[PDB]
Design a protein around this ligand. Structure first.
Ligand SMILES: Cc1cccc(CNC(=O)c2cc(C(=O)NCc3cccc(C)c3)ncn2)c1
Ligand SMILES: [Ca+2]
Ligand SMILES: [Ca+2]
Ligand SMILES: [Zn+2]
Ligand SMILES: [Zn+2]
Length: 169
């Protein structure tokens, strides 16, 4: 027999993702690079593997949309909500949605796609919000302006509590 796991998490280390559509704001290459780097943020500190699918059903379906887009969390035009992701689970679980009424960038203007994606994928993997103002999972977008990204310890401790550290070196 089997009882449901203690925490909400993926039961397999091999996860797949699919970029269903693209924002008008960035080139396909820029968007793909941003998401690849965002997934690497988490795979670098766990035993998780992320493989991209170009079609079909992936564990983490990524899409850009506006207003009503297929769930109970409609977006709201420019400003306000910017993105959301569902926790691990069947069907829409793990999916990540980005509000295309927002401005997405690979720089410091508007919302840095990589940064927001890293945050959203945290949710896709089982992390909720943190009270640490400097954590990636803090609820409010707080771009620091640093030239290099380093996953804050609070997030490292959080994701490893769910999946283990994988290779520690
Ligand atoms: C090369 C490079 C690229 C990008 C960023 C950096 C520097 N790092 C940061 O600026 C940073 C920001 C955040 C943060 O703002 N977290 C909260 C949050 C994030 C997204 C979405 C929501 C809703 C809330 N957490 C950790 N680090 C360097
Ligand atoms: Ca919005
Ligand atoms: Ca899914
Ligand atoms: Zn949605
Ligand atoms: Zn969040």
């Amino acid at each position: 027999y089997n009882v449901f796991p203690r925490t909400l998490k993926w039961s397999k280390m091999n996860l797949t993702y699919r970029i269903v559509n693209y924002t008008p704001d960035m080139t396909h290459s820029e968007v793909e690079k941003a998401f690849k780097k965002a997934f690497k943020v988490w795979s670098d500190v766990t035993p998780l593997n992320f493989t991209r699918l170009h079609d079909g059903i992936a564990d983490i379906m990524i899409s850009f949309g506006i207003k009503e887009h297929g769930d109970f969390y409609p977006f709201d035009g420019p400003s306000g909500l910017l993105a959301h992701a569902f926790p691990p689970g069947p069907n829409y679980g793990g999916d990540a949605h980005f509000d295309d009424d927002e401005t997405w960038t690979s720089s410091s203007k508007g919302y840095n796609l990589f940064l927001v994606a890293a945050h959203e994928f945290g949710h896709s993997l089982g992390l909720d919000h943190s009270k640490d103002p400097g954590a990636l999972m803090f609820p409010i977008y707080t771009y620091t302006g640093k030239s290099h990204f380093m996953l804050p310890d609070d997030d490292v401790q959080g994701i490893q509590s769910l999946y283990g550290p994988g290779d520690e070196d």
